[PDB]
Amino acid sequence: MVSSYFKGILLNLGLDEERIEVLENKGGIVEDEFEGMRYLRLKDSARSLRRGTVVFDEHNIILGFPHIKRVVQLENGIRRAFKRKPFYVEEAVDGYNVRVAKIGEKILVFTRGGFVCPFTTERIEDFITLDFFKDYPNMVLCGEMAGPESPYLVEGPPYVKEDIQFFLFDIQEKKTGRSLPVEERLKLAEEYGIPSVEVFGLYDLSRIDELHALIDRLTKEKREGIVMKSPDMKKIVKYVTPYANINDIKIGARIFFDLPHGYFMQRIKRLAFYLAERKIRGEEFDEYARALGKVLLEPFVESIWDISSGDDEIAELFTVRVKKLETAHKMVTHFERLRLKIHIDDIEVLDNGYWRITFKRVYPDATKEMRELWNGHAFV
Amino acid sequence: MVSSYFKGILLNLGLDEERIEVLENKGGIVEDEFEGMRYLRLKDSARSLRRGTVVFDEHNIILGFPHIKRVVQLENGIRRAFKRKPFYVEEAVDGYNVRVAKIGEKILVFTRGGFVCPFTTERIEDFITLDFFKDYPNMVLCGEMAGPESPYLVEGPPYVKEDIQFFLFDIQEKKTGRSLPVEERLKLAEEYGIPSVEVFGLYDLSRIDELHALIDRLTKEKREGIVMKSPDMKKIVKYVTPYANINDIKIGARIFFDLPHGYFMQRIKRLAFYLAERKIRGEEFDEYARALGKVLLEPFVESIWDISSGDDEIAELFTVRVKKLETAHKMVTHFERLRLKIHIDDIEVLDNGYWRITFKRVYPDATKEMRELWNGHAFV
Ligand SMILES: Nc1ncnc2c1ncn2[C@@H]1O[C@H](COP(=O)(O)OP(=O)(O)OP(=O)(O)O)[C@@H](O)[C@H]1O
Ligand SMILES: Nc1ncnc2c1ncn2[C@@H]1O[C@H](COP(=O)(O)OP(=O)(O)OP(=O)(O)O)[C@@H](O)[C@H]1O
Ligand SMILES: [Mg+2]
Ligand SMILES: [Mg+2]
Numbered sequence: 001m002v003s004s005y006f007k008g009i010l011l012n013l014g015l016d017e018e019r020i021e022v023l024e025n026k027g028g029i030v031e032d033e034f035e036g037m038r039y040l041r042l043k044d045s046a047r048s049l050r051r052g053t054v055v056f057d058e059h060n061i062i063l064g065f066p067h068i069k070r071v072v073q074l075e076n077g078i079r080r081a082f083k084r085k086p087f088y089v090e091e092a093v094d095g096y097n098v099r100v101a102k103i104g105e106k107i108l109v110f111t112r113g114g115f116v117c118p119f120t121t122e123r124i125e126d127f128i129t130l131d132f133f134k135d136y137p138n139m140v141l142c143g144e145m146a147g148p149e150s151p152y153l154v155e156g157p158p159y160v161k162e163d164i165q166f167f168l169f170d171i172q173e174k175k176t177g178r179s180l181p182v183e184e185r186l187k188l189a190e191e192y193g194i195p196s197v198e199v200f201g202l203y204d205l206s207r208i209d210e211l212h213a214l215i216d217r218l219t220k221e222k223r224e225g226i227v228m229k230s231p232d233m234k235k236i237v238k239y240v241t242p243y244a245n246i247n248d249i250k251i252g253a254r255i256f257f258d259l260p261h262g263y264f265m266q267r268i269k270r271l272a273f274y275l276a277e278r279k280i281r282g283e284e285f286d287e288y289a290r291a292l293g294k295v296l297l298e299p300f301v302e303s304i305w306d307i308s309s310g311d312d313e314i315a316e317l318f319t320v321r322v323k324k325l326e327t328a329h330k331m332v333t334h335f336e337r338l339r340l341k342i343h344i345d346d347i348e349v350l351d352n353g354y355w356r357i358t359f360k361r362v363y364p365d366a367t368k369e370m371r372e373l374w375n376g377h378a379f380v
Numbered sequence: 381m382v383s384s385y386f387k388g389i390l391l392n393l394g395l396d397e398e399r400i401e402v403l404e405n406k407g408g409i410v411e412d413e414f415e416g417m418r419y420l421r422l423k424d425s426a427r428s429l430r431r432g433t434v435v436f437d438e439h440n441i442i443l444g445f446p447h448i449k450r451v452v453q454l455e456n457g458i459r460r461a462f463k464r465k466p467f468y469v470e471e472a473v474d475g476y477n478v479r480v481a482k483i484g485e486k487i488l489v490f491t492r493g494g495f496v497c498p499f500t501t502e503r504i505e506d507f508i509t510l511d512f513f514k515d516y517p518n519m520v521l522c523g524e525m526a527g528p529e530s531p532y533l534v535e536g537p538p539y540v541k542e543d544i545q546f547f548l549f550d551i552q553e554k555k556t557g558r559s560l561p562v563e564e565r566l567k568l569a570e571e572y573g574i575p576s577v578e579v580f581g582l583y584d585l586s587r588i589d590e591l592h593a594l595i596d597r598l599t600k601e602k603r604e605g606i607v608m609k610s611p612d613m614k615k616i617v618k619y620v621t622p623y624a625n626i627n628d629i630k631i632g633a634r635i636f637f638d639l640p641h642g643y644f645m646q647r648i649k650r651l652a653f654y655l656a657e658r659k660i661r662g663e664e665f666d667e668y669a670r671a672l673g674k675v676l677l678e679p680f681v682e683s684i685w686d687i688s689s690g691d692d693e694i695a696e697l698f699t700v701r702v703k704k705l706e707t708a709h710k711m712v713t714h715f716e717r718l719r720l721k722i723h724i725d726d727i728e729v730l731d732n733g734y735w736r737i738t739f740k741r742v743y744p745d746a747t748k749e750m751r752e753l754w755n756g757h758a759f760v
């Protein structure tokens with residue numbers, strides 16, 4: 001299942017031979033390839049090697065991006081995580097996570113599971129100077145790809161009016177995964193002109209009222225929320241706006257079936273705790289309740305009416321911009337490998353020479369279940 | 381774990397010795413006791429022996445009540461289950477399921493998991509003549525206990541103004557579980573004066589418009605829905621009103637945590653399919669969306685505010701009526717055995733000589749999680 005070349009590497013990293021065999025047989029490690037280069041991807045955790053870690057050789061090991069804990073009560077979340085010490089407050093940008101690293105003579109861009117993304121790898125030169133990797137070849141840039149023309153999301157931050165943008169939020173060492181302190185990271189981003197998530201400033205528990213005001217502005221502006229980081233990057237906590245929880249439900253409700261466990265419940269919970277903590281009552285409360293009822297039912301009922309007539313499946317349309325038509329071919333292949341039913345719906349050339357590709361992604365498992373229910377399937 | 385007396389019985393029922401040992405070691409069969417009488421309860425299925433089956437000896441075997449399939453699209457559900465043949469339409473009564481059987485010289489009442497219910501066993505003479513069991517000692521009466529003074533539910537049908545009532549919906553053979561045809565069951569209920577679920581009549585697919593009208597009336601009347609049964613009792617399908625789905629959410633949302641998987645999602649799905657099938661749009665649609673948002677958020681936020689100050693836990697209050705004070709003592713013991721934190725809050729004697737017991741049921745697992753979140757616990 002997995003070559004002894006990679007298993008030798010895992011052994012030298014101190015992993016036990018028996019654990020490697022178990023990971024192999026269960027499919028917790030898998031081999032992959034990009035542009036002819038073989039690498040190992042960790043589908044599950046293995047001692048200190050986090051999920052989404054990729055292994056090309058003994059030196060080029062890109063650690064998986066860690067989970068970020070969230071709180072649902074902002075004031076008491078801050079007191080428990082940070083007490084009264086200062087912490088940085090950054091914008092949470094609603095996109096997809098990327099790790100950017102120099103591998104051999106190539107700059108590769110990895111998404112969360114450890115896949116080389118062919119779109120982001122082609123485009124990354126539009127946002128990040130290669131100079132950074134001439135000077136720091138063993139550092140990994142971590143950030144969010146976000147905007148209205150995204151291959152993986154149908155929403156994005158409102159101030160990105162077209163195409164897509166990179167937003168740096170961490171710099172990590174190859175192999176160890178260690179993060180630079182906030183200040184050194186921000187100094188490097190300025191030195192190299194790497195675009196950064198907005199840094200709102202340095203806060204503490206005593207400034208909770210200003211953070212609530214910040215959350216209300218981010219909400220009105222359709223932005224996702226904040227991420228709170230101790231200066232040494234060891235304590236990290238995220239907190240998202242009611243807009244993000246409501247809009248997430250709206251998007252997911254078109255499909256409803258086959259989503260991650262708890263997708264809707266977790267967001268209803270986050271909304272309830274926001275309303276409780278902010279003591280929201282009366283008409284302002286009713287407006288959230290009406291909005292939640294609408295985003296749960298309207299997209300869902302619309303899809304039901306859609307599938308009740310015809311053979312067409314539930315579908316999302318999205319566009320991306322590419323420099324080379326061959327990149328779009330490579331995204332189709334990559335989408336197939338991820339077991340997604342996506343084809344090219346439309347192509348246009350833009351006045352700046354870029355290709356705008358319109359993709360159509362269909363959802364056959366959600367479609368099947370929704371249709372069987374409409375057609376009267378009885379179930380326990 | 382389980383006595384060889386009961387294992388001998390399972391062997392004579394054709395079960396394999398190895399399966400018995402597995403069921404024992406996993407806890408799929410467990411011993412229980414009521415008023416000194418030992419019996420075996422099936423916590424999981426075992427070949428033809430359904431979950432909730434109880435075994436006292438070789439003759440007294442009460443088969444677990446089968447799952448009833450539901451549809452979420454009424455018209456196509458009827459076409460798929462019944463085609464154009466006639467079927468009976470009964471009221472779905474919102475209570476708890478009981479099986480009533482003569483065991484030795486005792487009439488015992490079993491709830492769904494196979495527990496002897498001490499409350500319903502004391503009270504069952506108020507609703508069912510013992511004459512039935514003098515004439516049919518090997519038949520089991522199956523029905524719903526429902527009303528405003530229930531030990532297990534906080535809602536009920538509106539026309540039961542006080543106390544609680546039994547509603548027959550099946551008659552089954554001991555040991556085999558076989559159901560009498562609808563007509564013979566209804567003839568027996570009339571012969572013995574056993575109160576019955578309302579039988580709305582005989583319907584077929586061609587009468588779908590009348591069934592929709594029936595559903596709209598049941599909805600306005602705060603009733604649960606219908607159960608559709610072929611005359612030979614072999615095809616059974618339930619369908620519940622939007623009122624039932626909305627009110628269920630309202631009740632569950634006070635607790636939110638520690639509920640069965642999919643409790644809220646399943647009901648949102650049922651609401652969406654009702655609105656789709658009935659083509660509900662405009663203001664009438666907005667009223668359902670507002671109602672769904674309110675029943676999800678208001679009870680939940682209210683409980684959050686409740687637990688954010690004090691040591692009191694989330695709690696429901698309910699009353700029952702008993703003939704003998706000793707019955708209330710026995711319900712306390714029984715609630716403890718079910719791993720529920722319930723104590724007696726108040727007692728009154730009624731002008732008819734019955735005791736009205738007020739119980740308080742607290743929810744410590746839901747309370748703990750809700751409080752840890754309020755206090756800023758961070759989680760992945
Ligand atoms: N300033 C930021 N700092 C760190 N991560 C950020 C920042 N802005 C956006 N992110 C993104 O947020 C992610 C973590 O929060 P998010 O709400 O997206 O959860 P997730 O990891 O995608 O999923 P889940 O909660 O299901 O595990 C990071 O992995 C990163 O992609
Ligand atoms: N007329 C009726 N015929 C049959 N069962 C009825 C009738 N009226 C009410 N019931 C009750 O409905 C139950 C089945 O439907 P219900 O919606 O209560 O699901 P459930 O068995 O409690 O749970 P789940 O769907 O989670 O398995 C029966 O077990 C019985 O208690
Ligand atoms: Mg995200
Ligand atoms: Mg979002």
Ligand SMILES: [Mg+2]
Binds near residue numbers: 305306311
């Ligand atoms: Mg269609």
Ligand SMILES: [Mg+2]
Binds near residue numbers: 474
């Ligand atoms: Mg029920």
Ligand SMILES: [Mg+2]
Binds near residue numbers: 535627
């Ligand atoms: Mg109910």
Ligand SMILES: [Mg+2]
Binds near residue numbers: 686687689
């Ligand atoms: Mg309190």
Ligand code: NA
Binds near residue numbers: 066067068
């Ligand atoms: Na995460």
Ligand code: NA
Binds near residue numbers: 153154
């Ligand atoms: Na888009």
Ligand code: NA
Binds near residue numbers: 348349350351
């Ligand atoms: Na053009």
Ligand code: NA
Binds near residue numbers: 446447
């Ligand atoms: Na059931």
Ligand code: NA
Binds near residue numbers: 533534535697698699
């Ligand atoms: Na009650």
Ligand code: NA
Binds near residue numbers: 728729730731
């Ligand atoms: Na009195």
